[model samples]
Target: GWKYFKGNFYYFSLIPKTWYSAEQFCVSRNSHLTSVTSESEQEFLYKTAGGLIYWIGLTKAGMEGDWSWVDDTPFNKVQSARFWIPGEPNNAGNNEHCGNIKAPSLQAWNDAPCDITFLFICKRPYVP
Candidate 1:
């Protein structure tokens, strides 16, 4: 199985799914979508996954361009160093409000509707 890293957390490179569906699945397992708190975290995540995209904990469902983590945490920092292509987050023709990590090779992000079925990364707080 493929693996992904973000911050101190590790994730499984499972198939992608809609933001809500992904959230549900994660919640079922006492987890949530992936979240990164720092540059090192993002780097870890990027490096862990060789070449596969996974659903993140960000979405703009309430308002356009309003990206927020699944934990309802404020997005005060810019952790997405591997920036998206131009004209992105346009909300596109449809309500493309969710965020996903594309393979390092993909030039730009493909605005996908939330209903689309895909794999996602779920995360739980590490217990010591």
Candidate 2:
């Protein structure tokens, strides 16, 4: 089910799925993986996740270190630097090309392998 927050409706998955599968799931539902584009959005997601790792709509699929939102949300790299925990986006193990929330706080994002299964968050604009 979707929960209304701000101007969007969010859905948190109960079952784990690979990042790509999660992406597809959201699409099938007429939405896309959630994007954290601001501090409030980040905080809402962090609190909702309840310390569990969840896939967000971010990936570095092209040109290493160039992260982009799957829904084409404009990203502000300068302001988003605080979202990642220190030393994160390190691309650990080389295949860690996908972004996930891995901590309980706001600065919880981490890069992990897209093939790993994890719960995910999906979002769509709320319409009257």
Question: Model 2: per-residue lDDT, tens digit, 1-128?
Answer: 89899999999999999999999999999999988988898999999899899999988746646988999887668888999978998888888878999897878899999999999999999888
lDDT of 1 by residue, 12-116 (tens): 645667779889888887778877566565555555555666777767635435666786666653544344545565567667877766555333233456776
Residue ranges of candidate 1 with Cα displaced over 4 Å: 1-8, 61-65, 77-82, 105-111
C-alpha lDDT of residue 75 in model 1: 69
The candidate that achieves the highest lDDT relative to the unseen native structure? 2
- Tell me how candidate 1 scores on lDDT: 0.62
User: 61 in model 2: Cα distance from truth in Å?
Assistant: 4.1
**Separate clash counts for every candidate:** 8, 0
Candidate 1: minimum summed lDDT over ten consecutive residues — where? 1-10
